[PDB]
């Protein structure tokens, strides 16, 4: 059986991706690549015809789709629009199809956060809040203490996504550096530190 892999899963805006196809029957007709499942005459993208080296592009080309006679198809210049699932039918040298899917998923990078705090110099037993400033929406945001992960307990509380991170009651050993961390399956940055003084 044929099968796809995306090169790579997981693409950044502007990047590139290689529908892979593997296990192309060697006797085929014809192919064409299709936005999304099952096959559509609209979401046709490319058809290419084996014999004669043929390539037609059909509705939804967007001068960016090559095609191989290999069966792969390489996307430049991606966008979040493009992220989902497409479809290779192959037509063999009777005229019985054949269909195999694949999908990726296409994110923008993580911008550069800040960390703020409430007050450096804290009183034992106090609160503070830390806050992870990013305009990034629908982030992953993890926090870190003296460069590790920071672990939680019962004095911690997230909020927003986990952008405030508000400790209560601090404790002696709640002194070290922060930084709040940002991420998607593509990119990662890290805030400044805030050093943390207790008494
Ligand atoms: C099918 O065709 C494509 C393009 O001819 C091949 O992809 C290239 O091969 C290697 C492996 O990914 C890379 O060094 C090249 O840069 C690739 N081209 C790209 C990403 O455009 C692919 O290996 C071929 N082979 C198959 C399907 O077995």
Same mark, same amino acid.
């Given at each position: 059986?044929?099968?796809?892999?995306?090169?790579?899963?997981?693409? &950044?805006? *502007?990047?590139?991706?290689?529908?892979?196809?593997?296990? %192309?029957?060697?006797?085929?007709?014809?192919?064409?690549?299709?936005?999304?499942?099952?096959? $559509?005459?609209? &979401?046709?993208?490319?058809?290419?015809?084996?014999?004669?080296?043929?390539?037609?592009?059909?509705?939804?080309?967007?001068?960016?789709?090559?095609?191989?006679?290999?069966? !792969?198809?390489?996307? #430049?210049?991606?966008?979040?629009?493009?992220?989902?699932?497409?479809?290779?039918?192959?037509?063999?040298?009777?005229?019985?199809?054949?269909?195999?899917?694949?999908?990726?998923?296409?994110?923008?990078?993580?911008?550069?956060?800040? %960390?703020?705090?409430?007050?450096?110099?804290?009183?034992?037993?106090? !609160?503070?809040?830390?806050?992870?400033?990013?305009?990034?929406?629908?982030?992953?945001?993890?926090?870190?203490?003296? !460069? #590790?992960?920071? #672990? %939680?307990?019962?004095?911690?509380?997230? $909020? #927003?996504?986990?952008?405030?991170?508000?400790?209560?009651?601090?404790?002696?050993? *709640?002194?070290?550096?922060?930084?709040?961390?940002?991420?998607?399956?593509? $990119?990662?940055?890290? $805030?400044? !530190?805030?050093?943390?003084?207790?008494?």
């Amino acid at each position: 059986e044929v099968t796809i892999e995306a090169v790579p899963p997981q693409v &950044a805006e *502007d990047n590139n991706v290689l529908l892979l196809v593997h296990n %192309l029957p060697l006797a085929l007709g014809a192919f064409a690549w299709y936005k999304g499942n099952p096959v $559509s005459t609209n &979401a046709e993208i490319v058809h290419f015809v084996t014999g004669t080296n043929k390539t037609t592009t059909g509705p939804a080309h967007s001068g960016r789709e090559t095609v191989y006679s290999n069966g !792969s198809l390489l996307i #430049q210049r991606v966008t979040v629009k493009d992220t989902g699932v497409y479809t290779i039918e192959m037509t063999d040298e009777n005229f019985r199809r054949t269909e195999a899917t694949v999908q990726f998923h296409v994110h923008q990078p993580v911008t550069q956060p800040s %960390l703020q705090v409430t007050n450096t110099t804290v009183k034992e037993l106090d !609160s503070v809040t830390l806050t992870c400033l990013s305009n990034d929406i629908g982030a992953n945001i993890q926090w870190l203490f003296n !460069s #590790q992960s920071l #672990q %939680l307990t019962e004095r911690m509380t997230l $909020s #927003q996504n986990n952008s405030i991170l508000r400790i209560d009651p601090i404790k002696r050993e *709640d002194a070290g550096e922060y930084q709040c961390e940002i991420s998607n399956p593509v $990119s990662v940055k890290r $805030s400044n !530190s805030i050093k943390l003084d207790i008494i």
